[PDB]
Amino acid sequence: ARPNPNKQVVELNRTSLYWGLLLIFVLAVLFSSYIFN
Amino acid sequence: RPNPNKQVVELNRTSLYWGLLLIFVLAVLFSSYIFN
Amino acid sequence: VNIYGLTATALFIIIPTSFLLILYVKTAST
Amino acid sequence: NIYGLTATALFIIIPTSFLLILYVKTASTQ
Amino acid sequence: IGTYQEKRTWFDDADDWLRQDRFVFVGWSGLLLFPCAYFALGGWLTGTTFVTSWYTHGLATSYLEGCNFLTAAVSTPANSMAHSLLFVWGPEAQGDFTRWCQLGGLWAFVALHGAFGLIGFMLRQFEIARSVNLRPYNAIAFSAPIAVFVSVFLIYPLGQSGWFFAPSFGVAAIFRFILFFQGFHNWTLNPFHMMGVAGVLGAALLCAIHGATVENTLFEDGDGANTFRAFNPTQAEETYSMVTANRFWSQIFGVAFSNKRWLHFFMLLVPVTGLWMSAIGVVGLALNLRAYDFVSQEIRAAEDPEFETFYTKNILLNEGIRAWMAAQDQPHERLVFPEEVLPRGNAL
Amino acid sequence: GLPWYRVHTVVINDPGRLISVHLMHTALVSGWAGSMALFEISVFDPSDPVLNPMWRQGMFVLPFMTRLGITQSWGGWTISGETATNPGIWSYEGVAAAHIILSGALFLASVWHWTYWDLELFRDPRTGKTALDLPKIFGIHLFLSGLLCFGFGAFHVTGVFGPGIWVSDPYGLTGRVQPVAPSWGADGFDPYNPGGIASHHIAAGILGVLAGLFHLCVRPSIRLYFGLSMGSIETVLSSSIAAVFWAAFVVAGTMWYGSAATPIELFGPTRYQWDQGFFQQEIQKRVQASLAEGASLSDAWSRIPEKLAFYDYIGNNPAKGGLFRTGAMNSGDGIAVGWLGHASFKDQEGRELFVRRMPTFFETFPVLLLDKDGIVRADVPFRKAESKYSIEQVGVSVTFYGGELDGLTFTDPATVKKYARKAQLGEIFEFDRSTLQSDGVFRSSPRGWFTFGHVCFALLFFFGHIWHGARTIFRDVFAG
Amino acid sequence: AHIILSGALFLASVWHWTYWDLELFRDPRTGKTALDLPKIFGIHLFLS
Amino acid sequence: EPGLVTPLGTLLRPLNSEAGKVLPGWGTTVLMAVFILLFAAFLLIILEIYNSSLILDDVSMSWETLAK
Amino acid sequence: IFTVRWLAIHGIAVPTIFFLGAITAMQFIQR
Amino acid sequence: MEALVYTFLLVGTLGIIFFSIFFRDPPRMI
Amino acid sequence: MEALVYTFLLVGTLGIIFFSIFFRDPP
Amino acid sequence: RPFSDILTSIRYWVIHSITVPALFIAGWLFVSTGLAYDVFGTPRPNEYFTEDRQEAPLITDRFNALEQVKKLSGN
Ligand code: CLA
Ligand code: CLA
Ligand code: CLA
Ligand SMILES: C=Cc1c(C)c2cc3nc(c4c5[nH]c(cc6nc(cc1[nH]2)C(C)=C6CC)c(C)c5C(=O)[C@@H]4C(=O)OC)[C@@H](CCC(=O)OC/C=C(\C)CCC[C@H](C)CCC[C@H](C)CCCC(C)C)[C@@H]3C
Ligand SMILES: CC(C)=CCC/C(C)=C/CC/C(C)=C/CC/C(C)=C/CC/C(C)=C/CC/C(C)=C/CC/C(C)=C/CC/C(C)=C/CC/C(C)=C/CC1=CC(=O)C(C)=C(C)C1=O
Ligand SMILES: CCCCCCCCCCCCCCCC(=O)OC[C@H](COP(=O)(O)OC[C@@H](O)CO)OC(=O)CCCCCCCCCCCCCCC
Ligand SMILES: CC1=C(/C=C/C(C)=C/C=C/C(C)=C/C=C/C=C(C)/C=C/C=C(C)/C=C/C2=C(C)CCCC2(C)C)C(C)(C)CCC1
Ligand SMILES: CC1=C(/C=C/C(C)=C/C=C/C(C)=C/C=C/C=C(C)/C=C/C=C(C)/C=C/C2=C(C)CCCC2(C)C)C(C)(C)CCC1
Ligand SMILES: CC1=C(/C=C/C(C)=C\C=C\C(C)=C\C=C\C=C(C)\C=C\C=C(C)\C=C\C2=C(C)CCCC2(C)C)C(C)(C)CCC1
Ligand SMILES: CC1=C(\C=C/C(C)=C/C=C/C(C)=C/C=C/C=C(C)/C=C/C=C(C)/C=C/C2=C(C)CCCC2(C)C)C(C)(C)CCC1
């Protein structure tokens, strides 16, 4: 029990955010018609 | 031109706990009426 | 049993939770 | 329609909340 | 005398006289608060002492008629008047006084003058706060009682058929109003009333805990057992240990306050929110928008004769209240219920 | 920095972002209007305009569009059931599309104004600081408002250039969009007089133009300027909140109590029409006139329009619904199909009996058959009680005049009891609670929902006014 | 039974996360974190 | 530092230029008070007419006004 | 003499004593 | 279905209470 | 309401594209 | 003039000893002479039920209530 040396922080720049949002929305657009059947 | 009026919002852990408790309690109270 | 009630409850549970988590993470990181 | 609508809503909301939380964590430290 | 150092006029002299410090602070808002509140109290007392309700409600409500403090009230006007303002010079009373008092106008007089007195009182709180140079949180707190009064005594009767269904200024009259809401509106089941009662009980709880915690964490600032005397109002040192109270309540309950400002603001905030939500609920009731029944359980009970819950028993009790009380509560309907149609437990 | 409830305070000290944010809100409002119009047009069923009107199907924005002239639709149907000769550009779909396009344009303007916040217009040349002359801004905006009010009153409502407003007969039978001639007399202040609207708008536009010119020319007094903090932007917020909640209270009152601006064809009948038996008295007057003229009961009762009988029904009362009984009026008690005709109850002796109508308060009311004098002659013995005045014991019979069941006479005690229970609610109608799977419990008309929402909003805005006025008056202590 | 096992494993995971600087994972010679992968493999294969 | 310059901004500059100027003394406060009193009287008249507490022969105060 | 304190005290007191006498008188009327 | 929703809401509220009691922000300089 | 959700998804994608074009972070 | 000085002065005592009992007897006479029943319209304990109605009154119309209340009261 002490400060763990393996300490790191995750980062995500704006370009990555846009890529992720676009991927999610495109996948939803592609699969919504199939899921609603 | 950069805006001089720049500020950042803060929300300590106590505020997060209060907000989560408030929304969950409201959902608990109103779920019976919403479902009817 | 109606879809409207369930979806309204789900949205009301999730959206404010996401907003509060956003603000808390912003505060903690700073 | 309840299954599909619920699945679509969750798939839209939860990953977007996760990505927004990560970005807001990143953007706090200039 | 102002920013540009200009002359003085009538307004300046009036302002200097009105704001002059004395035993009874008048202020600008005094011209509205004092006469309105005085006439509200006077009307209530002279109505509960001499005026009757025989012609408006068919009841005897006064000290002259033989009623005590608990069963005396200033009853609302008859349902025939609907939402008439009912001035003493109005078409209903035609300028007569004894007819006006006999006709129920005294209730409208008391209610209107009291509402304006409440407005004047909040204005006075604002004036005092400005004079002393303090944030006017007291007026923000007092906003909730005004909201409750407006919702119950003004908005609700306006939403209904007339002033007749407003509360009457009396103890037994208020109890009648409460039971009427229980029987007809199912007011206990409305979530807004639930939130209001939660707020009120939480405010009482906060008051009790704050008082006990402060009085049980004092610093030994003097000798003897009487701790009340060991306090100097001009001292600049805290009179109780915040750290000890925080530790005690964090180890007993799990969470404890650590900021005095936040604690006292929470004490301010709980009851105000509770009564504001109650006012919103009453506003909803004014339009018969009742959270009366649960459709699913009603359908299940109708379909299945063996299905009983406390909700259905409450529904039956409400039906009994309505049927057995509307015969004499609302004379203008001239309801004559045969004894064989009144709901009644068949077991006897 | 700032707590979660002050995040929008960063806009107080610069006008450009204020313009951008107000544009964003206006765009959101316009988008909501367009989307709601499209949704209601998608859901609306114009098949039956006499027994399934707009207020019966839970339409909210559709009556507001219909009130000002928009009646036709691109689908080939009018609001009166007639075919659309020429829908024109100004149709329901056209209005919705126009609102959406306006929302988009406002959003783009908001983005542009947010991007370019530093403008020389907002800087005073004397000191080079962002300052707004609030009295002159108020003068300009008041002049514009007065001009618009006068234009709307004189050219649209009057019908000189515009189509006009909706005008209907007192009983709401034949109402159409008609031009109104403004009434300058005392009757112009009658709320049920349509010409009062035009007269008010013309006079208020003239006075607003004059006041705008005055506030544009004359500068405020120093005592007034410092007393009301005319140099601060927050006092304008407090005064505006006061004005808007006053307006909301007035509008909610007019909607609840009925006026010429809320026709019953669009928002349904009111509570006090049922409380005072308005349509019942009109129907009785018509029946008595027909009988005095000389005709059989069936002929007299067959001349009553089904619309007038439909208005005389507890189901259409706005004060019979519930807070959480969501949905349209059709979803509770079904969809009206036809009129079953007036029901008359007579005992074995031939004495005429009437059912005591249900008051608005009572969720459940016992059924009582009483004679002309007022003495009760029969009643249903609760649920499982024994009675001396039961329906079968007295032998009550029901005859139907007019409607679908004209001429019939039932004597089965179960049938008589059922029809008495259905007639205590007013006129008897046929419903099909199968298409929408109706619950059977009453809902509330758009009148009640609008009144509830706007009274609640006004009540909350009262506290808003209190808080913002307190912040304005006590700015020095609040800031530091 | 599976639900109760899941809860117990959750508690054990929390404990093992909280306390990580165990002497068991330290090399006796160097004093640094190490794992003797062949021997752990032997033990786990024996159990399997 | 100077702000952005636009022809529309140049046209609209005089409207916002005269900022902070006041008229010395009490100005036209008495006229404002008179107008406020007149408006209060007018609002009372309207409220009483609508409330049926002030009956005028011309007005009917009912739905039958639509029958005129 | 006619200060605001005098006005308030007497305006609250005179009707109070008058009504107290009235109530005491009403205590004795037979029903 | 609705019973499951109520149970989930109550369990979530209890979990939030537990986290607030135990995983709280340590108070400094009371 | 399937057309409604399809349109909402398409409009969301278009909005993401617009925001990526016009609100990109500086280099 | 502190309240201690107000109480001490004998002028206040002598001027109040002639007025307080006057007000008390004024109220007692107001009740006893029956003027209260007349000015406020409160029915006397014998005129609650007149032979014309024998029941509680019920006002019907607001505009003509002026005559109706008096005809119901028997006046
Ligand atoms: C010129 C453009 C334009 C036009 C022709 C319309 C036309 C219409 N709109 Mg749209 N709308 C517009 C712009 C426009 N709108 C914009 C910019 C917005 C965003 C704010 C909206 C948001 C909007 C919504 C949200 C709704 C409409 C609705 C409507 C319809 C009913 C209008 C109505 O009843 O108003 C009545 C208007 C009032 C009662 C306003 C009263 C104003 C108060 C009294 C002024 C008081 C302050 C004043 C300045 C004091 C001084 C007075 C005097 C001294 C000068 C109608 C088809 C409704 C509908 O059914 O369509 C979907 C609806 O729900 N509109
Ligand atoms: C002044 C505002 C206003 C008014 C009067 C109306 C009135 C109406 N609307 Mg419209 N509507 C509005 C705003 C408004 N709407 C807005 C802003 C939206 C966008 C979200 C909609 C979207 C909308 C749809 C999609 C539909 C309606 C429908 C209706 C009708 C039925 C209303 C009903 O069921 O009540 C329901 C009333 C309540 C549920 C009461 C809620 C009040 C409390 C305070 C809510 C508190 C919730 C709280 C946060 C806790 C949440 C717990 C969680 C589990 C949910 C009625 C004509 C329906 C209809 O028949 O029209 C075709 C319909 O299908 N409206
Ligand atoms: C014309 C209307 C108007 C305007 C322009 C403002 C503007 C402002 N208010 Mg005021 N206020 C108003 C009405 C208004 N308010 C009303 C009606 C109330 C009573 C409820 C208040 C009560 C109030 C308080 C108590 C405080 C303010 C504060 C503020 C400032 C910051 C607000 C902020 O960042 O919130 C940001 C809000 C959020 C991030 C979350 C809000 C979420 C709620 C639940 C609304 C959810 C959206 C809602 C459902 C959309 C529908 C709205 C409805 C009207 C249709 C800003 C100057 C604050 C201030 O000045 O601090 C210095 C402050 O302390 N206001
Ligand atoms: C029944 C409960 C109740 C009562 C009796 C009450 C009474 C009072 N609270 C006051 C204050 C407050 N109350 C506050 C919060 C609250 N108050 C609450 C509940 C109450 N508050 C609640 C629940 C809250 C939580 C939000 C605050 C924050 C304040 C103050 O600042 C203020 C104070 O300083 O307290 C000392 C005083 C205002 C005096 C006044 O208006 O003078 C003027 C007199 C007027 C306007 C005449 C009243 C006219 C009334 C409306 C009609 C006539 C009523 C009859 C005369 C009596 C009827 C008798 C009944 C049996 C029906 C007064 C002592
Ligand atoms: C299976 C299961 C679980 C079944 C149970 C189902 C069931 C019935 C669930 C109940 C559902 C439920 C929760 C219903 C309630 C719903 C309801 C009415 C919600 C109200 C919602 C709401 C918005 C209300 C508005 C009013 C409002 C704001 C109320 C808040 C009330 C509130 C939290 C009050 C405070 C209570 C409280 C315990 C305070 C203690 C404070 C405290 C620790 C002080 C200690 C302390 C004191 C000092 O003096 C000092 C100095 C220090 C330092 C210090 O520390
Ligand atoms: C043996 C006892 C075992 C524990 C008993 C139960 C303890 C429960 C404690 C819950 C506290 C939750 C606080 C969260 C938010 C939180 O962390 O608060 C933290 C807060 C202290 O905040 P601070 O003073 O540190 O804030 C400093 C400021 O600068 C910022 O807030 O404590 C309070 O406000 C006291 C009020 C508690 C009020 C509790 C009400 C009861 C819970 C609600 C009802 C639950 C119903 C459940 C139905 C299923
Ligand atoms: C979507 C999807 C997916 C995924 C999925 C998943 C992954 C899921 C998961 C899920 C999960 C993962 C779930 C879980 C759950 C859990 C739970 C539910 C738990 C519970 C527990 C409990 C309840 C306990 C309790 C307790 C304890 C703690 C101990 C003691 C006792 C008691 C009882 C108290 C994929 C991609 C593949 C594809 C397909 C689809
Ligand atoms: C100032 C101001 C204001 C206001 C303004 C206004 C809006 C004004 C108006 C005003 C007005 C608008 C007024 C009016 C008035 C009217 C009147 C006053 C009338 C009268 C009438 C009469 C008197 C008549 C009589 C008679 C009859 C009834 C018939 C027969 C003959 C005889 C003669 C008998 C405000 C608050 C906003 C803000 C602040 C400033
Ligand atoms: C813009 C535009 C566009 C597009 C559009 C689209 C395609 C869509 C939209 C869509 C949408 C879709 C919109 C919407 C909006 C909405 C809103 C704006 C809403 C709001 C709501 C609210 C506000 C509510 C509230 C509440 C709740 C939550 C519940 C109940 C209660 C209360 C009321 C509180 C474009 C670019 C192409 C072109 C131009 C124009
Ligand atoms: C209305 C009016 C009028 C008249 C008159 C007046 C204003 C009066 C007032 C009056 C008053 C203002 C009165 C008062 C009274 C008071 C009293 C009467 C009190 C009593 C008390 C008592 C009796 C107590 C008791 C007790 C207690 C609580 C404590 C101890 C114990 C015992 C139990 C002893 C006129 C028409 C001209 C005008 C308008 C207004």
JSON list of N, CA, C and O in Angstrom, two decimals, chain E residues 277-290:
[
{"chain": "E", "resi": 277, "resn": "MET", "atom": "N", "xyz": [-42.48, 22.98, -4.65]},
{"chain": "E", "resi": 277, "resn": "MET", "atom": "CA", "xyz": [-43.03, 21.81, -5.32]},
{"chain": "E", "resi": 277, "resn": "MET", "atom": "C", "xyz": [-44.47, 21.55, -4.89]},
{"chain": "E", "resi": 277, "resn": "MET", "atom": "O", "xyz": [-45.32, 21.16, -5.71]},
{"chain": "E", "resi": 278, "resn": "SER", "atom": "N", "xyz": [-44.78, 21.77, -3.60]},
{"chain": "E", "resi": 278, "resn": "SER", "atom": "CA", "xyz": [-46.16, 21.65, -3.16]},
{"chain": "E", "resi": 278, "resn": "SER", "atom": "C", "xyz": [-47.06, 22.65, -3.87]},
{"chain": "E", "resi": 278, "resn": "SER", "atom": "O", "xyz": [-48.20, 22.33, -4.24]},
{"chain": "E", "resi": 279, "resn": "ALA", "atom": "N", "xyz": [-46.57, 23.88, -4.06]},
{"chain": "E", "resi": 279, "resn": "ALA", "atom": "CA", "xyz": [-47.35, 24.89, -4.77]},
{"chain": "E", "resi": 279, "resn": "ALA", "atom": "C", "xyz": [-47.61, 24.46, -6.21]},
{"chain": "E", "resi": 279, "resn": "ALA", "atom": "O", "xyz": [-48.71, 24.66, -6.73]},
{"chain": "E", "resi": 280, "resn": "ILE", "atom": "N", "xyz": [-46.61, 23.89, -6.87]},
{"chain": "E", "resi": 280, "resn": "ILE", "atom": "CA", "xyz": [-46.81, 23.40, -8.23]},
{"chain": "E", "resi": 280, "resn": "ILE", "atom": "C", "xyz": [-47.85, 22.29, -8.26]},
{"chain": "E", "resi": 280, "resn": "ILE", "atom": "O", "xyz": [-48.71, 22.24, -9.15]},
{"chain": "E", "resi": 281, "resn": "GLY", "atom": "N", "xyz": [-47.81, 21.39, -7.27]},
{"chain": "E", "resi": 281, "resn": "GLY", "atom": "CA", "xyz": [-48.81, 20.34, -7.20]},
{"chain": "E", "resi": 281, "resn": "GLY", "atom": "C", "xyz": [-50.22, 20.89, -7.02]},
{"chain": "E", "resi": 281, "resn": "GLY", "atom": "O", "xyz": [-51.17, 20.41, -7.65]},
{"chain": "E", "resi": 282, "resn": "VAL", "atom": "N", "xyz": [-50.37, 21.90, -6.17]},
{"chain": "E", "resi": 282, "resn": "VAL", "atom": "CA", "xyz": [-51.69, 22.50, -5.97]},
{"chain": "E", "resi": 282, "resn": "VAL", "atom": "C", "xyz": [-52.15, 23.20, -7.24]},
{"chain": "E", "resi": 282, "resn": "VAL", "atom": "O", "xyz": [-53.34, 23.14, -7.60]},
{"chain": "E", "resi": 283, "resn": "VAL", "atom": "N", "xyz": [-51.23, 23.86, -7.95]},
{"chain": "E", "resi": 283, "resn": "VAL", "atom": "CA", "xyz": [-51.57, 24.45, -9.24]},
{"chain": "E", "resi": 283, "resn": "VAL", "atom": "C", "xyz": [-52.10, 23.38, -10.19]},
{"chain": "E", "resi": 283, "resn": "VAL", "atom": "O", "xyz": [-53.09, 23.60, -10.90]},
{"chain": "E", "resi": 284, "resn": "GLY", "atom": "N", "xyz": [-51.46, 22.22, -10.21]},
{"chain": "E", "resi": 284, "resn": "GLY", "atom": "CA", "xyz": [-51.97, 21.12, -11.01]},
{"chain": "E", "resi": 284, "resn": "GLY", "atom": "C", "xyz": [-53.35, 20.67, -10.58]},
{"chain": "E", "resi": 284, "resn": "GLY", "atom": "O", "xyz": [-54.21, 20.36, -11.42]},
{"chain": "E", "resi": 285, "resn": "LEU", "atom": "N", "xyz": [-53.59, 20.63, -9.27]},
{"chain": "E", "resi": 285, "resn": "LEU", "atom": "CA", "xyz": [-54.91, 20.25, -8.76]},
{"chain": "E", "resi": 285, "resn": "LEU", "atom": "C", "xyz": [-55.99, 21.25, -9.15]},
{"chain": "E", "resi": 285, "resn": "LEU", "atom": "O", "xyz": [-57.16, 20.88, -9.29]},
{"chain": "E", "resi": 286, "resn": "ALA", "atom": "N", "xyz": [-55.62, 22.53, -9.31]},
{"chain": "E", "resi": 286, "resn": "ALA", "atom": "CA", "xyz": [-56.61, 23.56, -9.59]},
{"chain": "E", "resi": 286, "resn": "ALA", "atom": "C", "xyz": [-57.37, 23.28, -10.88]},
{"chain": "E", "resi": 286, "resn": "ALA", "atom": "O", "xyz": [-58.50, 23.77, -11.05]},
{"chain": "E", "resi": 287, "resn": "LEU", "atom": "N", "xyz": [-56.79, 22.51, -11.79]},
{"chain": "E", "resi": 287, "resn": "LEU", "atom": "CA", "xyz": [-57.41, 22.18, -13.06]},
{"chain": "E", "resi": 287, "resn": "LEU", "atom": "C", "xyz": [-57.92, 20.74, -13.10]},
{"chain": "E", "resi": 287, "resn": "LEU", "atom": "O", "xyz": [-58.12, 20.19, -14.18]},
{"chain": "E", "resi": 288, "resn": "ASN", "atom": "N", "xyz": [-58.10, 20.12, -11.93]},
{"chain": "E", "resi": 288, "resn": "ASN", "atom": "CA", "xyz": [-58.53, 18.73, -11.80]},
{"chain": "E", "resi": 288, "resn": "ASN", "atom": "C", "xyz": [-57.52, 17.76, -12.40]},
{"chain": "E", "resi": 288, "resn": "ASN", "atom": "O", "xyz": [-57.86, 16.60, -12.66]},
{"chain": "E", "resi": 289, "resn": "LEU", "atom": "N", "xyz": [-56.29, 18.21, -12.65]},
{"chain": "E", "resi": 289, "resn": "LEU", "atom": "CA", "xyz": [-55.23, 17.32, -13.11]},
{"chain": "E", "resi": 289, "resn": "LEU", "atom": "C", "xyz": [-54.72, 16.53, -11.91]},
{"chain": "E", "resi": 289, "resn": "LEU", "atom": "O", "xyz": [-53.74, 16.88, -11.25]},
{"chain": "E", "resi": 290, "resn": "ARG", "atom": "N", "xyz": [-55.42, 15.44, -11.62]},
{"chain": "E", "resi": 290, "resn": "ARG", "atom": "CA", "xyz": [-55.19, 14.66, -10.42]},
{"chain": "E", "resi": 290, "resn": "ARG", "atom": "C", "xyz": [-54.36, 13.42, -10.74]},
{"chain": "E", "resi": 290, "resn": "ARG", "atom": "O", "xyz": [-54.58, 12.75, -11.74]}
]
